[PDB]
Design a protein around this motif. Sequence first.
Motif, PDB file in Angstrom:
ATOM      1  N   UNK A  55       0.802  -1.211   0.000  1.00 50.68           N
ATOM      2  CA  UNK A  55       0.000   0.000   0.000  1.00 50.68           C
ATOM      3  C   UNK A  55       0.838   1.265   0.000  1.00 50.68           C
ATOM      4  N   UNK A  56       0.141   2.389  -0.057  1.00 51.40           N
ATOM      5  CA  UNK A  56       0.795   3.675   0.038  1.00 51.40           C
ATOM      6  C   UNK A  56       0.950   3.814   1.559  1.00 51.40           C
ATOM      7  N   UNK A  57       1.805   4.721   2.008  1.00 54.47           N
ATOM      8  CA  UNK A  57       1.975   4.899   3.444  1.00 54.47           C
ATOM      9  C   UNK A  57       0.672   5.531   3.944  1.00 54.47           C
ATOM     10  N   UNK A  58      -0.016   4.841   4.848  1.00 51.51           N
ATOM     11  CA  UNK A  58      -1.285   5.329   5.388  1.00 51.51           C
ATOM     12  C   UNK A  58      -1.047   6.136   6.664  1.00 51.51           C
ATOM     13  N   UNK A 134      -4.910   1.474  -8.353  1.00 51.98           N
ATOM     14  CA  UNK A 134      -4.960   0.386  -9.319  1.00 51.98           C
ATOM     15  C   UNK A 134      -4.537   0.926 -10.687  1.00 51.98           C
ATOM     16  N   UNK A 135      -3.561   0.255 -11.286  1.00 54.16           N
ATOM     17  CA  UNK A 135      -3.020   0.644 -12.582  1.00 54.16           C
ATOM     18  C   UNK A 135      -3.412  -0.365 -13.659  1.00 54.16           C
ATOM     19  N   UNK A 136      -4.007   0.135 -14.737  1.00 54.56           N
ATOM     20  CA  UNK A 136      -4.412  -0.703 -15.860  1.00 54.56           C
ATOM     21  C   UNK A 136      -4.032   0.073 -17.110  1.00 54.56           C
ATOM     22  N   UNK A 137      -3.179  -0.519 -17.936  1.00 56.05           N
ATOM     23  CA  UNK A 137      -2.719   0.169 -19.133  1.00 56.05           C
ATOM     24  C   UNK A 137      -2.979  -0.553 -20.445  1.00 56.05           C
ATOM     25  N   UNK A 232       5.486  -2.568  -7.279  1.00 53.55           N
ATOM     26  CA  UNK A 232       6.029  -1.227  -7.084  1.00 53.55           C
ATOM     27  C   UNK A 232       5.159  -0.453  -6.100  1.00 53.55           C
ATOM     28  N   UNK A 233       4.188  -1.145  -5.509  1.00 52.95           N
ATOM     29  CA  UNK A 233       3.314  -0.512  -4.535  1.00 52.95           C
ATOM     30  C   UNK A 233       1.973  -0.051  -5.070  1.00 52.95           C
ATOM     31  N   UNK A 234       1.368  -0.861  -5.938  1.00 55.11           N
ATOM     32  CA  UNK A 234       0.082  -0.525  -6.535  1.00 55.11           C
ATOM     33  C   UNK A 234      -0.942  -1.648  -6.495  1.00 55.11           C
ATOM     34  N   UNK A 235      -2.209  -1.265  -6.614  1.00 53.06           N
ATOM     35  CA  UNK A 235      -3.294  -2.230  -6.676  1.00 53.06           C
ATOM     36  C   UNK A 235      -3.695  -2.995  -5.435  1.00 53.06           C
TER      37      UNK A 235
END
Length: 243
Positions: A55-58, A134-137, A232-235
């Motif tokens: 996760x991102x730093x919460x 969430x990354x979708x490309x 890389x820290x996503x999704x």
Amino acid sequence: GGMRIEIKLLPLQDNPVIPFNYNYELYSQIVEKAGAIEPRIVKLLESPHGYWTFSRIIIRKREIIPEKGIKILSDDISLYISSSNKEIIKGIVEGIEKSPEFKIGDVGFLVADIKALKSKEIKNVNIFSTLSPIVVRTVKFEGDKLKHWDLYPHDELFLDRLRKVMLLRYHEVMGDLPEDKDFRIELIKFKPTRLIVKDSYIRGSLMVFRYYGSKEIAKFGYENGFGEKTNLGFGMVKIIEEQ
């Protein structure tokens, strides 16, 4: 079944301001720490197929300082990490226990605690909420080279792209395609995001969505993150009873 953990962080300095784009730096330190204890999982940690997510730093109480970063107004700070592979989690936990310090920009942190979270039951229908975008490309034209194009839930290609990505990652990580390959989602909440990862911007979606379908894929996304660039820290997502 994999494991999901929560890492509590304690900033050495008071009311520090961390940069917004720390993903690659954080990712690097986790991999560095885990590799020191088991060099064999580094390949899994760095694989673009996403054998894990974080996760991102919460930060419980924060303040966005334009052109500066995130101002931490509380000691209640958490970093969540997850993976379907228990061996990856143990490598990370041990690696961090041995080297408990993290550097984000010019701000230092001390790992204050590491707790295993309860992995909730995954059903055919789930409401997920993002802990990291969430990354979708997809691929679009850009001169004499193919440039990646980041999609959002309102994009016509989003769902089909997400479906393909999950099937591809599942095959690589789990070893074979899932028996049930179908699912759909319905957006509940949404906000776009933009983050510099190492040297390039990555656009994703912070979102709450209801998932319908394949339990195998829902479980995979819950444990290893939904979408791309998860390592890389996503999704990363969490389950919510109703929101």
